[PDB]
Amino acid sequence: AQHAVILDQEKYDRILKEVPTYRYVSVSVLVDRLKIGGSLARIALRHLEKEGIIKPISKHSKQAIYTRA
């Protein structure tokens, strides 16, 4: 199998409902329990944070840490 690198409508719908469930989210988490590739995860986090669904606590390019709120 291979991670997805282009976003189908099904996973887009999946992301928006699943992500608010998690205590802690990071690039590694989205690649693990969802199945998107790392290049999607970096895009998703910036979008979801802008949209206000996840709360930042620190950002460092080589690490990122967001929380449920």
Binding site: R23, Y24, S28, V31, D32, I57, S58, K62, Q63, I65
Partner: protein, 107 residues
């Protein structure tokens, strides 16, 4: 380390420096063996107990994050949390158990 304490403050909710102290105290072996061939069981001193705990924790983290996707901070955080619990899933807890049960066999 700076990133690690942040993660521990979100997975679970304790003061993270408290979680570190628990992992240290909970992990250090309390009995060991020496070569005499044959082996004999002996007690271990409090200072060596601290040294052993630190070494086991970071070695477990390093190997978990080689050829990884998770970063060092992710795996180190997970080790510490699992070891503050009694959870045998942590690398360090397994190592402690083997040392002590072998010592029991030889004493």
């Amino acid at each position: 380390i700076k990133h690690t304490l942040d993660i521990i403050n979100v997975l679970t909710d304790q003061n993270p420096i408290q979680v570190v102290v628990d992992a240290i105290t909970n992990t250090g072996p309390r009995e060991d063996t020496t070569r005499v061939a044959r082996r004999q069981a002996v007690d271990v001193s409090p200072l060596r107990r601290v040294n052993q705990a630190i070494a086991l924790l970071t070695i477990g983290a390093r190997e978990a994050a080689f050829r990884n996707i998770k970063t060092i901070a992710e795996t180190l955080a997970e080790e510490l949390i699992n070891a503050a619990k009694g959870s045998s899933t942590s690398y360090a807890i397994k190592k402690k158990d083997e040392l002590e049960r072998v010592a029991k066999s030889n004493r």
